[PDB]
Design an enzyme around this catalytic site. Sequence first.
Site, short mmCIF file in Angstrom:
data_model
loop_
_atom_site.label_atom_id
_atom_site.label_comp_id
_atom_site.label_asym_id
_atom_site.label_seq_id
_atom_site.Cartn_x
_atom_site.Cartn_y
_atom_site.Cartn_z
N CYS A 1 0.87 -0.90 0.08
CA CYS A 1 0.24 0.11 0.34
C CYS A 1 0.63 1.10 0.68
N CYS B 1 -1.40 1.67 -2.82
CA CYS B 1 -2.36 2.47 -2.26
C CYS B 1 -2.26 4.48 -2.78
N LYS C 1 -0.39 5.67 -5.34
CA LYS C 1 -0.86 5.58 -6.82
C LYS C 1 -2.12 6.59 -6.86
N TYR D 1 -8.82 -3.70 -11.32
CA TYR D 1 -9.46 -2.40 -10.69
C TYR D 1 -7.90 -1.85 -11.12
N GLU E 1 -7.13 1.97 -13.26
CA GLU E 1 -6.39 3.32 -12.24
C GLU E 1 -5.63 3.77 -13.19
N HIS F 1 -28.59 20.00 -0.95
CA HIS F 1 -28.34 20.27 -1.76
C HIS F 1 -27.41 22.16 -2.01
N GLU G 1 -26.95 13.50 -2.72
CA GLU G 1 -28.16 13.82 -2.21
C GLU G 1 -28.98 12.76 -3.11
C1 LIG Z 1 -27.81 33.12 -1.20
C2 LIG Z 1 -28.51 32.10 -0.55
C3 LIG Z 1 -27.27 30.79 -0.89
C4 LIG Z 1 -28.12 29.77 -0.57
N1 LIG Z 1 -27.93 28.05 -0.20
C5 LIG Z 1 -28.61 27.55 -0.40
C6 LIG Z 1 -27.22 25.90 -0.56
O1 LIG Z 1 -26.87 25.57 -0.83
N2 LIG Z 1 -28.59 25.01 -0.08
C7 LIG Z 1 -30.09 24.90 0.67
O2 LIG Z 1 -30.16 23.67 0.98
N3 LIG Z 1 -29.85 26.23 0.32
C8 LIG Z 1 -29.43 27.08 0.36
N4 LIG Z 1 -30.10 28.58 0.02
C9 LIG Z 1 -31.65 29.05 1.00
C10 LIG Z 1 -32.57 28.56 0.15
O3 LIG Z 1 -32.71 29.11 -1.13
C11 LIG Z 1 -33.39 28.14 1.15
O4 LIG Z 1 -35.00 27.69 1.90
C12 LIG Z 1 -35.06 28.30 -0.47
O5 LIG Z 1 -35.16 28.68 -1.64
C13 LIG Z 1 -36.50 28.06 0.90
O6 LIG Z 1 -37.89 28.26 -0.28
P1 LIG Z 1 -38.75 28.57 -0.38
O7 LIG Z 1 -39.60 27.60 -1.40
O8 LIG Z 1 -39.57 28.66 1.04
O9 LIG Z 1 -39.29 30.38 -0.89
P2 LIG Z 1 -38.03 30.36 -2.09
O10 LIG Z 1 -37.42 29.10 -2.74
O11 LIG Z 1 -37.44 32.14 -1.57
O12 LIG Z 1 -39.03 31.11 -3.01
C14 LIG Z 1 -40.54 31.58 -3.03
C15 LIG Z 1 -41.35 32.67 -4.40
O13 LIG Z 1 -42.05 33.31 -4.00
C16 LIG Z 1 -42.71 33.86 -4.77
N5 LIG Z 1 -43.56 35.15 -4.26
C17 LIG Z 1 -43.21 36.00 -3.06
N6 LIG Z 1 -44.43 36.75 -2.86
C18 LIG Z 1 -45.39 35.97 -3.85
C19 LIG Z 1 -46.41 36.62 -3.87
N7 LIG Z 1 -47.18 37.11 -3.79
N8 LIG Z 1 -46.62 36.34 -5.79
C20 LIG Z 1 -46.31 35.45 -6.23
N9 LIG Z 1 -44.95 34.81 -5.72
C21 LIG Z 1 -44.54 35.34 -4.76
C22 LIG Z 1 -41.53 34.43 -4.69
O14 LIG Z 1 -40.79 35.42 -6.37
C23 LIG Z 1 -39.87 33.42 -4.83
O15 LIG Z 1 -40.06 32.63 -6.03
C24 LIG Z 1 -29.29 29.44 -0.09
C25 LIG Z 1 -30.04 30.70 0.70
C26 LIG Z 1 -29.49 32.30 -0.31
C27 LIG Z 1 -29.82 33.44 -0.05
C1 LIG Z 2 -0.97 -0.89 -7.47
C2 LIG Z 2 -1.90 -1.24 -6.10
C3 LIG Z 2 -2.84 -0.69 -6.05
C4 LIG Z 2 -3.59 -0.15 -4.75
N1 LIG Z 2 -4.07 0.10 -3.95
C5 LIG Z 2 -5.18 0.20 -2.55
C6 LIG Z 2 -6.16 1.44 -2.58
O1 LIG Z 2 -6.08 2.42 -3.12
N2 LIG Z 2 -6.88 0.70 -1.27
C7 LIG Z 2 -7.00 -0.38 -0.65
O2 LIG Z 2 -7.32 -0.54 0.19
N3 LIG Z 2 -6.14 -1.26 -1.18
C8 LIG Z 2 -5.53 -0.88 -2.39
N4 LIG Z 2 -4.24 -1.59 -2.59
C9 LIG Z 2 -4.01 -3.68 -2.43
C10 LIG Z 2 -3.41 -3.29 -0.72
O3 LIG Z 2 -1.69 -2.97 -1.25
C11 LIG Z 2 -3.12 -4.46 -0.20
O4 LIG Z 2 -5.06 -5.35 -0.16
C12 LIG Z 2 -2.57 -4.71 0.83
O5 LIG Z 2 -1.13 -3.88 0.92
C13 LIG Z 2 -2.05 -5.81 1.33
O6 LIG Z 2 -1.03 -5.83 2.99
P1 LIG Z 2 -0.81 -7.23 3.60
O7 LIG Z 2 -0.33 -6.45 5.10
O8 LIG Z 2 -1.38 -8.56 3.65
O9 LIG Z 2 0.28 -7.50 2.61
P2 LIG Z 2 1.82 -5.81 2.50
O10 LIG Z 2 1.30 -4.26 2.34
O11 LIG Z 2 1.26 -6.07 1.12
O12 LIG Z 2 2.93 -6.24 2.47
C14 LIG Z 2 3.51 -7.66 3.00
C15 LIG Z 2 4.77 -7.46 3.69
O13 LIG Z 2 5.73 -8.13 3.51
C16 LIG Z 2 6.71 -8.48 3.67
N5 LIG Z 2 7.36 -9.88 3.44
C17 LIG Z 2 6.98 -10.73 2.19
N6 LIG Z 2 7.78 -12.19 2.33
C18 LIG Z 2 8.97 -11.64 3.54
C19 LIG Z 2 9.78 -12.33 4.15
N7 LIG Z 2 9.52 -14.03 4.47
N8 LIG Z 2 10.36 -12.09 5.50
C20 LIG Z 2 9.91 -10.59 5.35
N9 LIG Z 2 9.60 -9.82 4.77
C21 LIG Z 2 8.50 -10.15 4.19
C22 LIG Z 2 6.80 -7.72 1.99
O14 LIG Z 2 7.96 -7.05 2.04
C23 LIG Z 2 5.93 -7.12 2.50
O15 LIG Z 2 6.08 -5.17 2.89
C24 LIG Z 2 -3.16 -1.74 -4.38
C25 LIG Z 2 -2.77 -2.97 -4.67
C26 LIG Z 2 -1.49 -2.79 -5.43
C27 LIG Z 2 -0.59 -3.87 -5.57
#
Ligand SMILES: Cc1cc2nc3c(=O)[nH]c(=O)nc-3n(C[C@H](O)[C@H](O)[C@H](O)COP(=O)(O)OP(=O)(O)OC[C@H]3O[C@@H](n4cnc5c(N)ncnc54)[C@H](O)[C@@H]3O)c2cc1C
Ligand SMILES: Cc1cc2nc3c(=O)[nH]c(=O)nc-3n(C[C@H](O)[C@H](O)[C@H](O)COP(=O)(O)OP(=O)(O)OC[C@H]3O[C@@H](n4cnc5c(N)ncnc54)[C@H](O)[C@@H]3O)c2cc1C
Lengths: 461, 461
Positions: free
Chosen positions: A40, A45, A48, A186, A190, A450, A455
């Site tokens: 690894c 791991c 890579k 895999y 990769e 969101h 999500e």
């Molecule tokens: C800058 C910003 C970033 C945000 N980022 C996120 C986020 O990343 N993730 C997340 O989950 N939430 C986020 N929010 C919060 C999210 O936007 C609100 O919680 C969500 O929009 C609430 O929806 P609502 O239906 O309560 O009212 P709104 O979505 O505000 O919609 C109300 C609607 O009622 C209309 N309306 C009002 N009065 C009248 C009327 N008298 N007649 C006709 N139409 C009317 C308005 O025009 C509007 O279109 C963010 C909010 C802001 C301000």
């Molecule tokens: C290219 C590649 C990418 C991988 N990517 C991931 C990943 O992203 N995520 C993940 O979970 N797994 C990944 N794996 C798998 C992971 O590396 C193995 O499952 C893990 O290393 C196994 O651990 P181990 O203890 O069984 O043996 P190893 O980790 O292989 O270690 C065994 C050790 O025994 C030693 N040894 C052997 N014989 C002797 C001896 N006679 N005397 C003394 N020492 C000895 C060797 O030198 C070695 O250091 C990847 C493997 C490869 C080849």
Amino acid sequence: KHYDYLVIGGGSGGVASARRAASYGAKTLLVEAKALGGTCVNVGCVPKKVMWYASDLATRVSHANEYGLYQNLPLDKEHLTFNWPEFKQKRDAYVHRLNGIYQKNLEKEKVDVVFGWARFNKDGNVEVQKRDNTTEVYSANHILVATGGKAIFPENIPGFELGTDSDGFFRLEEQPKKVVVVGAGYIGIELAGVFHGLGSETHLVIRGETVLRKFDECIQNTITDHYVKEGINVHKLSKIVKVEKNVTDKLKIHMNDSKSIDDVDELIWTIGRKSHLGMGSENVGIKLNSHDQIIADEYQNTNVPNIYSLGDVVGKVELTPVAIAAGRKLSNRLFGPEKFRNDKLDYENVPSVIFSHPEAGSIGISEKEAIEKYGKENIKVYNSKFTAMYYAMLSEKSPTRYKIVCAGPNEKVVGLHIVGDSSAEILQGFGVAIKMGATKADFDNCVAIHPTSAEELVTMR
Amino acid sequence: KHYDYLVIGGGSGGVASARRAASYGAKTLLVEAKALGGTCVNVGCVPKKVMWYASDLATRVSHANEYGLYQNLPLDKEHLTFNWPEFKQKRDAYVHRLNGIYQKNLEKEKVDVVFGWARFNKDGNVEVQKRDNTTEVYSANHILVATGGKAIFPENIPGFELGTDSDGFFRLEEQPKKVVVVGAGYIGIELAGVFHGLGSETHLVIRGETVLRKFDECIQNTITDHYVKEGINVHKLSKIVKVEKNVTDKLKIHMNDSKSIDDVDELIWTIGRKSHLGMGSENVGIKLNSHDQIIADEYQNTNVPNIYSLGDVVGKVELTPVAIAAGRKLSNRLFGPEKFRNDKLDYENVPSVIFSHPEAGSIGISEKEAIEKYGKENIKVYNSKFTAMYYAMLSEKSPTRYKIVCAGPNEKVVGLHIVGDSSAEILQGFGVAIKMGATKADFDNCVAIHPTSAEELVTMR
Ligand SMILES: Cc1cc2nc3c(=O)[nH]c(=O)nc-3n(C[C@H](O)[C@H](O)[C@H](O)COP(=O)(O)OP(=O)(O)OC[C@H]3O[C@@H](n4cnc5c(N)ncnc54)[C@H](O)[C@@H]3O)c2cc1C
Ligand SMILES: Cc1cc2nc3c(=O)[nH]c(=O)nc-3n(C[C@H](O)[C@H](O)[C@H](O)COP(=O)(O)OP(=O)(O)OC[C@H]3O[C@@H](n4cnc5c(N)ncnc54)[C@H](O)[C@@H]3O)c2cc1C
Ligand SMILES: *SC[C@H](NC(=O)CC[C@H](N)C(=O)O)C(=O)NCC(=O)O
Ligand SMILES: *SC[C@H](NC(=O)CC[C@H](N)C(=O)O)C(=O)NCC(=O)O
Ligand SMILES: *[C@@H]1O[C@H](CO)[C@@H](O)[C@H](O)[C@H]1NC(C)=O
Ligand SMILES: *[C@@H]1O[C@H](CO)[C@@H](O)[C@H](O)[C@H]1NC(C)=O
């Protein structure tokens, strides 16, 4: 000379297990032949993902101009440059720092660490050929074999030696202009993504029509199709049948459909891994299966008293967190409080991720597996297809595909499979819910966040 | 002229509710005075997140060189340019496009849509002044008031009119070189982050020592500290007491501590929102609270028979998904099958996100709230501090901070508060688990995904 616990392998499982044992007070010896952190940290791991980050950024930069940024600069595919040698050094530096940290921690947690090749002798002890040239013999009450795996080479293919494995990928000091990656697993998916995101003409060779054959078809199709669409040359229904070196020094790959790939600078085989068996396991009677993997029961017990095994060497769910967890639970059981006598790892519903482009994640069984296990009549599937809001400002697009597989009249979630940006980070929480026995109604019982991709998972059909 | 359901307000709640009611077969009228999608689509979630993507990418490009990319190009802060006018056009185009999709959906789902100002007359009917210049009067069996909110202006401050609100932010045609944002709320924190990421000299004015004072202290401190470190000028313990305009055309903002901010091109008040009234509420007897918000019970019933209210106009958990959900559940209850006759939204443990830099997420209660509710002795807190792997190749860094607040002997998760890259996408799944009653042991009962940030949440203290 004598320890409570001797761990063969300084990798993910070995390190975790040694540390847990020592935490409970247990004279512990850890033996590593190369570098701490195993596959690894050194060639897995960690490096890579660092390369993945580079590839990912390369793509993002190509979006900047449209996002209104740096418009005097030609931030496009045509002007893309990647300083592979320099980046390689930084990557190696980071990995080297991690080795140091590991060695530091083990010393501070009082685990003895020895570098050398460990092997079992006839007496049942462990001979370690050291890197100081001495050969010491050690004894212990408990021995863990966590030696991991190693890449498989297709030695039946003439010219096979002209390509490397994933380890070789990490040794590359210059970027290949034209790369061929073989295998739909895999690891290959990769590496192919990374090569292509960094500018290399990239080819991926697979036996079937689709990549990632172990995963749900939704993952298979989406990644297959997107890789083709983005420029990764996927050779489907193909197998390499011969490799040769030219006049030029480039390779020529010969396929079984009679087609070929010429002028190849680099060939990487990623066609599976096998158990790293180097110890004198035969000297102690450790049973191997028909795939030369060490057999272990649900408690990581080999057939030999006081000898345990886990991780890739056993080959069940080959992931780093799994080995770590099994390693820790084994140490809880052997050296921990009485309440951990029957501690063992649950290997079902382990989530996993593919750092493809786009990333993918999966936990549980596929739709096909669910139909087989529970019958069509009892499977309900929910799908969602969309393009993340990030692409609204762009001409280029990327797919997001979420699939929830449900079983029974309560619609228990037995599979969750996702494709799209952020999937790697999205999955964990859903994993926790699924391990809690989450149903579709449970997914629906949390208000959405969101705007996000995640999500969509709590508001489907 | 007569309907089953008449909805005043074409925003998040209004649109959702109208559509659900019409899905059950209900002659439905929706009245919107401006644009469908309300605050979120037109001047909220959507355009804010699009701008967020821009600032985010701007920062990312400044990491490319380090990541070995485009090294012949000076991709640094010094060379950053943002085409605000052009990007504004694309952003409006996207929003206008969403307006169209909404109009399309509604007329396809058989909701009559009328544009105009709606008001209650004494008869208890709704007269709408249109853009026909018509004025029709409509009657209905059920009336939903979902008019949303509007920004609060500090009318007690001389020169207050020299600044705008978040709506004004979205009307800006050109980028201000020097901008002042007032208020520690999430809207202003987000806008400040965007302005700064896009290159404007940014100032944020707050009454206390930290931003985001409705959230757990971990969120407050981390965002506050990172904003300062970043270069966002946070004026703590401050309040504007006077605004004036120079020769120049720029502003001078006078503080209560005798400090000043001069040469300011743009001032934006983000000091809270109030209920958007202005309909004929009075003509029908709808009771308002002491904050001039419409009162609504757990079923969104106002005090007047057949008149309901929800969303920002009521002011309980002012988020788009909440209004949507309340709107849907109201329609289920009023027009849906018998099943939903007691359907209502659970407003507790609604997850929410802050699109700051880095992003933050929160669900449940803060540490301080937990101690207050359950007692010190029954609260255990888990914390984790780390820098994501992405920063390993970089000199610049960003924090990740996770806090799990637990209550009782089972360590029930009553609060989850996170800061760091990907937090927005990470939280959802954990939200599902918390609504399932997750304990700490439940978080620990899913194997980790390596390498990710989310992973830290299932392997803590
Ligand atoms: C800058 C910003 C970033 C945000 N980022 C996120 C986020 O990343 N993730 C997340 O989950 N939430 C986020 N929010 C919060 C999210 O936007 C609100 O919680 C969500 O929009 C609430 O929806 P609502 O239906 O309560 O009212 P709104 O979505 O505000 O919609 C109300 C609607 O009622 C209309 N309306 C009002 N009065 C009248 C009327 N008298 N007649 C006709 N139409 C009317 C308005 O025009 C509007 O279109 C963010 C909010 C802001 C301000
Ligand atoms: C290219 C590649 C990418 C991988 N990517 C991931 C990943 O992203 N995520 C993940 O979970 N797994 C990944 N794996 C798998 C992971 O590396 C193995 O499952 C893990 O290393 C196994 O651990 P181990 O203890 O069984 O043996 P190893 O980790 O292989 O270690 C065994 C050790 O025994 C030693 N040894 C052997 N014989 C002797 C001896 N006679 N005397 C003394 N020492 C000895 C060797 O030198 C070695 O250091 C990847 C493997 C490869 C080849
Ligand atoms: S990624 C889109 C999904 N595709 C699949 O699930 C393919 C599944 C295999 N085909 C299966 O094993 O049968 C998807 O949502 N498909 C929806 C559809 O209607 O095809
Ligand atoms: S974000 C890091 C966390 N900080 C806080 O929780 C601050 C809380 C308040 N300042 C307060 O409690 O007064 C964190 O990791 N804190 C660890 C701790 O031990 O407080
Ligand atoms: C080439 O090998 C692949 C992989 O097994 C097979 O699917 C395909 O049919 C073969 N092509 C031939 C023999 O034409
Ligand atoms: C300025 O106003 C803030 C907010 O009320 C207050 O905390 C601070 O003490 C005031 N400063 C002075 C010097 O009055």
